[PDB]
C-alpha cells in the first residue's frame, strides 16, 4: 500500500486549492493544511521542506463523498479559495475540516451539526481551525441560526434526511446569494428504498428545480460508494458566479 | 505577568513592553474565544513560564560569559569580528592552535564543508564563505563587495589568530596594547569597505530631449 | 407621526423603574 514516508510529489489540481499527490505506485488527493502538522482524525498528512512550515493532508474518498465526487470528476464545485461555504451535515467535521482547508484563512465555513457529541468533535475542530464556525442545531429550522449565518455562496449538503429537498430549499432561500452554487449528496436508499435509484435521482432533481434551482451536472460517485449521486446545481440563474 | 483573561483588565503590562500593543491585547483577552481553564492548570502554565524565562536569563548571562572569556583568550579576534562568531570558529576548530594551523582560505570557507566538497568533487562553483557571512563586518558590504570583503576578512582573521595564538606578552600588558593588531585590521579594513561602497558607477552619455 | 417620542403612559411603561415613577406621577 501507500505506506508512510514515501517520496511523492504534489501538483495542482484543476480546482483551486486541491492538489494531487502522485508518487511511485500511488496517486491520491490532498489539500493544504492550515494548522500545520496536526492531524484531524489520524488522517495521513504530507510534509515538505521548502527552500518546514507547509504541510498537506490527504483525504480518503471512502470517507468523504466530497472527495469521491472530485475523483469522479465533477465540473466545478464552486468553492474557490475565498468563497463563503455553508455546510449541511457536519458529521463530526472530517470533510468539514477538508473544506475548511480548501477555503483557507480568508474564507469561511459555517457548519450545521444536530447531534451533540458529533458536535463536540465539531467544535473541537473549530477550536483548532479558525475559519470554520460551528452551528449545532436543527438544520430543518434555519431560523435557528439566521442570526448566525451571513450570505454564503456555496452550500454543500450531505444530510441523510427524507425531506432533503425542502430542507435545502428553505436553507437556500435564507442563505444563498443570487447566483448560488450548491452540491448535494443523494443516498437513494435513504430517500426511497423501493425505487430504482436513477429515478430517485430524477425526482430529487425535479423537486430542486421546483425549489427554483437549475441543475447543471450530476454523477454517480460509483466506485467509491453504492447508490449515491452527487448533484451540482445553481440557485436562481444559469452561469455560476455573477 | 497577566494571569487569566479574567485578570486581564487588572494586569499591568507596561513594565515589560510598551503600550499601544498591551491594550490591544487587553481588548483581545476580553474579546477572545478561548475556553476556560482552571487555576490549577494555570499554576502549571505559569510555572512552565518561570522555567523558560529562567532559561532565557541563563542563556543571556551565558553569552555575557562567552564574550568576556573570549576577550580574555583571543582579544585580537574578538576585536575583529566578535566573540560569538569567533567562538563558532574555535568550536569547529577543536582548539585555538587547531584553528591557527589553518590557512586563510580555510578560514574563508570555514564550515561549508558539504557544499564545498560537493562543488569540488563534481566541479561546480565553490561556496564563497561560511560563518563569516553571519559575522558582523560583512553585512555592511554588498554582493560583489561581499565577496571581496569575504577574502579580505579571511586573511586578516588568520593573521589575528596566529597573533593571539603565538605572540607572547610581558603580562603587564593592557588589553588594548595586546589587541592593537586586530584594531589596526579593523581600521584599515573598514576604510576599504567604505571605499568599495563608494565606488562610482559608469558614466553614460547624457541624453537630452532629441537623441542629441 | 413617529417624528417625536411620546410621554410614557402606563400602557407604554416597559420596565419596573417606569412603573414606579409612573405610580409616583399618578399619585402626584
Amino acid at each position: 500500500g501507500a505506506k508512510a514516508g514515501k517520496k511523492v510529489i504534489v501538483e495542482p489540481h484543476r480546482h483551486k486549492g486541491v492538489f494531487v499527490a502522485r508518487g511511485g505506485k500511488e496517486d491520491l488527493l490532498c489539500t493544504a493544511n492550515l494548522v500545520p502538522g496536526e492531524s484531524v482524525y489520524g488522517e495521513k498528512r504530507i510534509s515538505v521542506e521548502t527552500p518546514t512550515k507547509t504541510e498537506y493532508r490527504i483525504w480518503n474518498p471512502f470517507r468523504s463523498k466530497l472527495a469521491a465526487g472530485i475523483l469522479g470528476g465533477l465540473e466545478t464545485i464552486y468553492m474557490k479559495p475565498g468563497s463563503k461555504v455553508l455546510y449541511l451535515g457536519a458529521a463530526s467535521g472530517t470533510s468539514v475540516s477538508h473544506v475548511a482547508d480548501i477555503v483557507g484563512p480568508t474564507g469561511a465555513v459555517y457548519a450545521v451539526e444536530f447531534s451533540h457529541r458529533s458536535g463536540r468533535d465539531l467544535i473541537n475542530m473549530a477550536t483548532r481551525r479558525t475559519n470554520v464556525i460551528p452551528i449545532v442545531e436543527d438544520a430543518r429550522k434555519p431560523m435557528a441560526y439566521r442570526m448566525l449565518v451571513p450570505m454564503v455562496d456555496v452550500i454543500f449538503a450531505d444530510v441523510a434526511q427524507p425531506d432533503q429537498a425542502r430542507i435545502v430549499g428553505i436553507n437556500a432561500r435564507l442563505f444563498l446569494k443570487q447566483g448560488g452554487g450548491l452540491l448535494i449528496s443523494i443516498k437513494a436508499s435513504c430517500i426511497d428504498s423501493t425505487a430504482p435509484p436513477e429515478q430517485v435521482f430524477a425526482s430529487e432533481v425535479q423537486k430542486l428545480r421546483e425549489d427554483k434551482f437549475f441543475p447543471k451536472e450530476q454523477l454517480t460517485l460509483e466506485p467509491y460508494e453504492r447508490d449515491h449521486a452527487m448533484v451540482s446545481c445553481v440557485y436562481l440563474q444559469k452561469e455560476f458566479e455573477g | 505577568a497577566l494571569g487569566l483573561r479574567t485578570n486581564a483588565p487588572n494586569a499591568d503590562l507596561s513594565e515589560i513592553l510598551p503600550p499601544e500593543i498591551e491594550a490591544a491585547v487587553k481588548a483581545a483577552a476580553d474579546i477572545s474565544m478561548g475556553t476556560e481553564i482552571s487555576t490549577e492548570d494555570y499554576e502549571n502554565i505559569k510555572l512552565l513560564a518561570v522555567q523558560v524565562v529562567e532559561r532565557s536569563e541563563y542563556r543571556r548571562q551565558l553569552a555575557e560569559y562567552l564574550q568576556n572569556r573570549m576577550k580574555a583568550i583571543s582579544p585580537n579576534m574578538t576585536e575583529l569580528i566578535g566573540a560569538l562568531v569567533g567562538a563558532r570558529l574555535i568550536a569547529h576548530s577543536g582548539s585555538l592552535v587547531n584553528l591557527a594551523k589553518n590557512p586563510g582560505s580555510t578560514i574563508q570557507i570555514l564550515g561549508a564543508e558539504k557544499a564545498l566538497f560537493r562543488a569540488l568533487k563534481t566541479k561546480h562553483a565553490t561556496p564563497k564563505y561560511g560563518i563569516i557571512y553571519h559575522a558582523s563586518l560583512v553585512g555592511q558590504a554588498s554582493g560583489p563587495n561581499k565577496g571581496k570583503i569575504a577574502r579580505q576578512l579571511a586573511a586578516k582573521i588568520a593573521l589575528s589568530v596566529r597573533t593571539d595564538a603565538f605572540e607572547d606578552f610581558p603580562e603587564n600588558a593592557d588589553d588594548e596594547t595586546r589587541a592593537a593588531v586586530g584594531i589596526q585590521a579593523r581600521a584599515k579594513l573598514e576604510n576599504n569597505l567604505r571605499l568599495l561602497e563608494g565606488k562610482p558607477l559608469n558614466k553614460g552619455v547624457a541624453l537630452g530631449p532629441n537623441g542629441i | 407621526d413617529a417624528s417625536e417620542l411620546q410621554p410614557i403612559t402606563q400602557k407604554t411603561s416597559g420596565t419596573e423603574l417606569e412603573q414606579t415613577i409612573l405610580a409616583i406621577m399618578e399619585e402626584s
Binding site: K16, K80, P81 | - | -
Partner: protein, 31 residues
C-alpha cells in the same frame, strides 16, 4: 510618526496565489 518613504521602483509568475503558492519547479536532473 510620519517618515520618509523608501524608493524601490526598479514575466510569467512565480508562486501560485490560487493554490497557496506552490512554487515554480526548479528542475534538478533528479527531478
Amino acid at each position: 510618526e510620519l517618515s520618509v518613504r523608501v524608493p524601490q521602483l526598479p514575466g510569467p509568475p512565480d508562486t501560485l496565489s490560487d493554490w497557496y503558492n506552490i512554487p515554480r519547479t526548479n528542475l534538478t536532473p533528479e527531478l
